[PDB]
Design a protein around this ligand. Structure first.
Ligand SMILES: O=C(O)Cc1ccc(O)cc1
Ligand SMILES: O=C(O)Cc1ccc(O)cc1
Ligand SMILES: O=C(O)Cc1ccc(O)cc1
Ligand SMILES: O=C(O)Cc1ccc(O)cc1
Ligand SMILES: [Fe+3]
Ligand SMILES: [Fe+3]
Ligand SMILES: [Fe+3]
Lengths: 200, 233, 233, 200, 233, 200, 200
């Protein structure tokens, strides 16, 4: 068979990932332009929402050193790849969990619908990658919204998870923070209610 | 906006370290017990941010000036970023972080007894050029002890994060130094089952790139998932 | 006073580096052109100073305290001093000197751009124990550039001087670190023709002697001319 | 044949030998007790003398980074091996050449006569070892005195040098410094009047 | 009382059998799922009981007389106890237990059909001498079946317990006999990943120690963790 | 790197351990002197206590063949290393689990405080090593006392366990047995409430 | 370590070099355009000079088969890389030694000052490469002018030669030839007064 060059092997981001990718969090001085947790400017179209969550280990203990990256379409279901701080909306962002509270937050808008390769529309979702000490290779997952049952029911990706009970792990529960629209999405790496992780 | 025009070669999860590698203690409780669910690639997975427009400072990639001169071995770390097809990956984001010459990180949580260097931060970033090259100038990091086994030591390493053309290519890894006797003993290095894969994480001394009477240089090339056009889809 | 009671095994001048080793430039003009004159051993050559009574300070052998803490990789350098017959050489003087973590020496003449460490001197001394052991605690030195070829670099090393039981055994040498990619390229290392002899100058990582969460350790054993009693003289 | 363990190979002391063995010279702070160039205390028996010299390379240029060690008997021809700063006389000492002037000095007494292994008396001499950048393995030599021709003529060691003209290289020329008895001993590593070096 | 002056070389947990070794069924439910927590050594761990004052009976180490004569292959089992540095461990407690010639244990719970031997107990103890030597006189045990797989048989063995200088050195193991074909088929042996580790458990026939016309002899040396003095602590 | 002689590999004690180390328990005649479960004689200084516990496997079933060895300081915080049956106190003992009830018992005194290497006092504790069929290499743990919370709170060792919840697994529950002070220390080898095991 | 493709090894030019690079000298017909010893046309700006010299071997004998190439800045301290016979000034030239007299000659102008990499000006100099039978790899040297002592004194390159005496070997002696400014630059390959040769 034909073999290509091998991809560089992954390695855990380790406990100090923050110094490299979450400067503020590391409690170090930031640079002029930093990639962080505010994807949308007040003035960006779409429903502005707040995302928050906690990460749990196999013992049910909070993971206070996680690093997450997110990718989502804009309110129009368009992926805005040209990252710029001047953008009203950026499709990419980064967040991390408090060493104390252990909670991450992200400020965005609700993503528009996009079609899979076969032309079928997928339910609104945010692609997430998680990194942390103890994780050799990052975990891929998706965040869906509880207020979109109809779409969720028809998502071709969500429909690929064999057991319906497992699908539920991917649904963020709508709440409100300071009378602001929020969704809580807790990730459970291992054990009871273990979050579904993807390979692609 | 981005468009779904390519497919990425499937990752080899037997080449990369598995999730559960018991000698690396923390991985016990941080590894999923259910199998990953494979999903076909869509625009969601085949696109990613482009950092061409990010405003980088003039010394973003220079750790000797981005934070007096730091104490330690002056070195340049450079290489190329290509895909599995050998194609250069231009304008891609390369981020790095490391400890000081003593193995001390500039982080709250680092309580190792080796002191902090008043002139060393240890964070760098560089956008690869039109040919896929990147370069940094820093000092060589010191190994450091960690609470795993009763006497575990991380071989000196530099942390790297690479964006690539999609979220499908994003990768975080660690570069090690050619000949470090600590590599073969590290449970994290050993999280990688294939010895051949380990070789891939070893930076080679590159005397060709060194600045006589100034600094040495190490070469570290990075290979990201091969990128191809869709066909008969 | 001393007495002529022993003979030392003749030195192997083909094992040791020759005087003229052209790649090491300065040796051209500093090597004798006439042959050495061999002379039979006498009390003059078979005796030497004993430093048992020298008043050493409490941190003479500790470079981390003998000069704040220095920046760099904390290491212990220990070993044993024996003769060619495998016999320990007790109460013998071991002196060492080295650069800082950046390869900068605390000497007038060192103009290398790497800074000086406010808390590092780099001089140590230790009298071997009853069993021939010695130990030092310091930081690992950085390689340094020198004006030989247009891009020559000394592999990190520690300088050692050892007295032994006579002036016939006195020796000055350099310890190198297991795996340093710079060793095979150094014209000074190469002043030694036999590859097997080079191995003898390489300090081995000794995890057994390291202090968990504190410092690593290297083992460097020293072999001095074998000592025997005169016979049928 | 029987082979023993190999002796550790020599290496040049390099240009910074002073930091390790000639602290003052390195221009660094000294320790309580240092091994230096004063073998005899004012009150030590024997003729007190001053030794001085320069070292020359093959191009006839001064070697300003040399390090020398010396070993000699006391005025009684006895080797005083128990090194102590309290000693009126020590058989061992160390000196080095000025980075400027390039001259070394030593303060001692004239050595007593000692017999070789065969019981034959050797002329008064000081054993010297020289170290420097560019010298892979130290050079061994002896210093003899011009005012002891009679003994010099009968020295069994001096008599081992094939060519009489070469023997002269080992004779220090008596002089006087500040009306003090001195002897000048210049070493020529290579070329014209190359100093005799030993192997033992 | 005891004092904290020693440190022990960190155990190699890849050398020793891992906790979970599924072919050895019982290990399944008797192996922790959480990682061991490594702690620095303190007086608590570097001290241990000394059995010098224990009053041992005359035949404590002689299984031929300590319980007529047992039926079976008369043998002497002797060897030395050293630490990883090769230093003898004098005055240390060595305890052993085994089955009789037919593989039957003198224990309530052993219902194997091979009969008990009226003149055989199966227990011995010996304090090492000044040189670290111990000896026992017994009969060679027989292999015996066990409910693991449907046809599992332990190779002939003698269980050993050695105290050593501290609770950190205490160990329990099994001695197997040179050339027994059951050796490589045992899941308990096989709990040991490295074939070189297995070799360490095999007693060698020692005709040199045999008593002619009387009994054979086997040699079994044991290596406890290396003991070193503290330094720069 | 330097490699020493490798330590002899451990092997399970097996089901019949008792025959060699717990004669009474094996139900075999004992010798004159046996190392057993009575560390202190009635006249030994310190608070005399009764320690008991059970050991569970991963299925929650009793391990009726376990063998335990203990090491502790006397009341004065001193380790009595010279084992002797005449001593009123021995720092070393042995116990095993009933094939029936499956509980082990030990008769000792509450250990005094000892300091770590750094000179920081550790809370009163008992060092335990557990052996049994199914255990390839022995398990190391420590027993702490519930009525020593202040001290437990400051223990340098207990403080090494990341998760606060796991520390509770090392705390023996004070009780009374026949109006005699007792502490129950249950060991769970695996699963829920798994006891912390150490390496050193 | 990283290894590139190895450079093609050098080989002596040999005795017949002239046939390939000094046609006139080889005494063979020349082609329309030849690279020779006239760097400047009479109308080129700068002080026109005549350079001549001889080359000696280690026995003090004339090397009558040497071939030299020169590289220098024009009067303005600029390197004219675009070789052209029409130019009034060419930064590049070639000359050779007479089989008879054994002297080479070049017609140029005193080079202007150029700075090193560090921005420190170098004294006016001419880069020379020497070739000949017996020379396995060409020798690199520089010619300096005796009437530029101030500058010579500050040359970052000349200042790299440790021994002051060796620096004099690079200084051309000003003279006059037919009342025309000349400078004589003798090259001694080996032995007494050996010319300094460079590596870079
Ligand atoms: O996960 C760990 O604690 C080990 C480790 C520490 C630092 C680092 O940068 C990488 C891994
Ligand atoms: O002789 C030299 O210049 C090279 C060198 C420099 C420093 C040193 O310590 C040893 C050799
Ligand atoms: O664990 C087991 O049941 C097998 C075994 C039996 C007896 C023995 O002595 C050792 C292990
Ligand atoms: O140097 C020599 O004389 C041998 C030689 C002859 C001709 C040639 O072209 C090259 C080298
Ligand atoms: Fe790290
Ligand atoms: Fe050096
Ligand atoms: Fe058994």
């Amino acid at each position: 068979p034909i073999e290509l060059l091998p991809e560089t092997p992954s390695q855990t981001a380790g406990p100090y990932v923050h110094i490299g990718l979450a400067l503020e969090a590391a409690g170090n001085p930031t640079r002029d332009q930093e990639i962080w947790n505010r994807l949308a400017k007040p003035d960006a179209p779409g429903e502005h929402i707040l995302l928050l969550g906690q990460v749990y280990d196999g013992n049910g203990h909070l993971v206070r050193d996680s690093f997450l990256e997110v990718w989502q379409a804009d309110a129009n279901g368009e992926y805005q790849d040209a990252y710029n701080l001047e953008n009203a909306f950026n499709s990419f962002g980064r967040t991390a969990t408090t060493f104390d509270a252990g909670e991450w937050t992200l400020h965005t808008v609700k993503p528009g619908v996009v079609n899979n390769a076969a032309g079928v529309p997928m339910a609104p979702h945010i692609n997430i990658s998680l990194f942390a000490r103890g994780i050799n290779i990052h975990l891929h997952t998706r965040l869906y919204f509880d207020d979109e049952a109809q779409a969720n029911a028809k998502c071709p990706v969500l429909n690929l998870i064999e057991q319906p009970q497992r699908r539920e792990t991917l649904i963020a529960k709508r709440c409100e923070v300071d009378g602001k629209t929020a969704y809580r999405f807790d990730i459970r790496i291992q054990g009871e209610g273990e979050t579904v992780f993807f390979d692609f | 906006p981005a468009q779904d025009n390519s497919r990425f070669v499937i990752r080899d999860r037997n080449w990369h370290p598995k999730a559960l590698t018991p000698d690396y203690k923390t991985s016990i409780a941080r590894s999923p017990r259910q199998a990953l669910v494979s999903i076909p690639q869509s625009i969601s997975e085949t696109t990613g941010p482009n950092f061409s427009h990010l405003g980088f400072g003039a010394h973003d990639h220079d750790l000797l000036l981005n934070f007096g001169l730091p104490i330690g071995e002056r070195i340049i770390v450079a290489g190329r970023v290509v895909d599995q097809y050998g194609k250069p990956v231009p304008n891609t984001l390369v981020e790095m972080w490391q400890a000081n010459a003593g193995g001390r990180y500039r982080h709250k949580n680092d309580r190792y007894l080796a002191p902090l260097d008043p002139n060393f931060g240890g964070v760098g970033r560089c956008l690869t050029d039109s040919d896929g090259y990147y370069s940094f100038r820093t000092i060589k990091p010191g190994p450091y002890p960690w609470r795993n086994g009763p006497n575990d030591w991380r071989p000196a390493h530099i942390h790297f994060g690479i964006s690539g053309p999609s979220i499908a290519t994003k990768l975080i890894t660690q570069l090690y130094f050619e000949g470090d006797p600590l590599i073969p003993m590290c449970p994290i290095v050993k999280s990688i089952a294939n010895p051949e894969a380990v070789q891939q994480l070893i930076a080679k001394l590159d005397m060709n790139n060194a600045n006589p009477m100034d600094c040495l240089a190490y070469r570290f090339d990075i290979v990201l998932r091969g990128q191809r056009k869709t066909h008969f889809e």
